[PDB]
Structure formats: C-alpha cells, structure tokens
Amino acid sequence: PQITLWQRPLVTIKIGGQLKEALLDTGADDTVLEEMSLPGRWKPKMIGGIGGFIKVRQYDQILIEICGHKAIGTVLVGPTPVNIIGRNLLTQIGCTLNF
Amino acid sequence: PQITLWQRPLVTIKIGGQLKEALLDTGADDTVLEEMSLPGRWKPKMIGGIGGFIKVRQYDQILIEICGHKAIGTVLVGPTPVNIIGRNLLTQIGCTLNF
Secondary structure, eight states: OEEOSSSOOEEEEEETTEEEEEEEOTTOSSEEEOSOOOSSOEEEEEEEOSSOEEEEEEEEEEEEEETTEEEEEEEEESOOSSOEEOHHHHGGGTOEEEO | OEEOSSSOOEEEEEETTEEEEEEEOTTOSSOEEOOOOOOSOOEEEEEEETTEEEEEEEEEEEEEEETTEEEEEEEEESOOSSOEEOHHHHGGGTOEEEO
C-alpha cells in the first residue's frame, strides 16, 4: 500500500502467533515492542531515544508478519510508549519513503 | 525520491540560509530541531519519546526546504540528539510510506 502521514502509520502485525498493531517508524534503527513473551535466548541492551535511554531485552531472528509481509530479524522488548517497527524490519518488507 | 531504509534516511534541510541535515521520521508527530536562531515568539511545551521527556520551544510558520521541497509548518526546538522531520512536515512535502 501507499500510506499517507496525516495520522500515525499504525499497521497490523502478527508476532508470537498474536495480532497486535505497531507504528512504522523510519526514525528507529531497530524494532521495539511492549512487554510480551518471545522464544529463544535474550540479551540485555540499552537503546536511546529522544528523552534518554531504556533497558530492553534483545531477541534474535524473530518472525513478524507486517501487514501480511514476512520479516525476520531482531526484536527488542521493553517499556516503549508504543510498539515500533524500525528499519531493521522495514527493509525486509521493501518499505520506502516516497515524495 | 524513493528512499530505502538500509541506512538512516537523512536529508538536507534549509532554514534561513542555514543548511543542516535531518532524519525523515515517520515515528514523530512533530519536527524537532537543534537551535537555529528562529526569530519571533514561541510557546514552551513538553514532548517525549523513548527514554523520557524534553522541554522544547514551539515556533509556528517556519519556512523550511526539505530535500528541495518547500514547506511551511511548526518546528520544535530543543535538546534532541538528531534533527527530526516529523509527520507535520512530511505531509507537506507529499511523503508517503510504500510497500
């Protein structure tokens, strides 16, 4: 699709077998989701945003279907205000900014 | 252009004769810049994102050129580590997300 930007670009995602919604965020290097269960080993990481740093758990090679499109990559879990799909997964669906 | 997301989508911006660079950020409601000596009145307000909140000065009706495209809109000036072009200005240049 072509998504205009008059409202937040929220889309349906499927992760962990569950439907959620998340913000397509070209300003985020990687993907950060609110607290949830994911498979595999996690590693502690710090990530920085506009207001400072937060602690997250990093999971590797996680499957996420974004508007029906498959992506596999790193997913961070932590106290983000909103679920964010960052560039590491946007690239996997061929997302581009067009003007 | 049609900008992929393998690297941060930084573009040239021009305000008052000053050339800077800024991140095209679909995750931001607002545009947040470094100090640019914008003349005129402002309104203080708080914004936030990952990591917490920051104080900004809101300046309206700022003329900005973003990757060559002229726009007019509100700019928030505050202690952001990276200049961010948010949706309020992405809409004005006709920017969409596509996949």
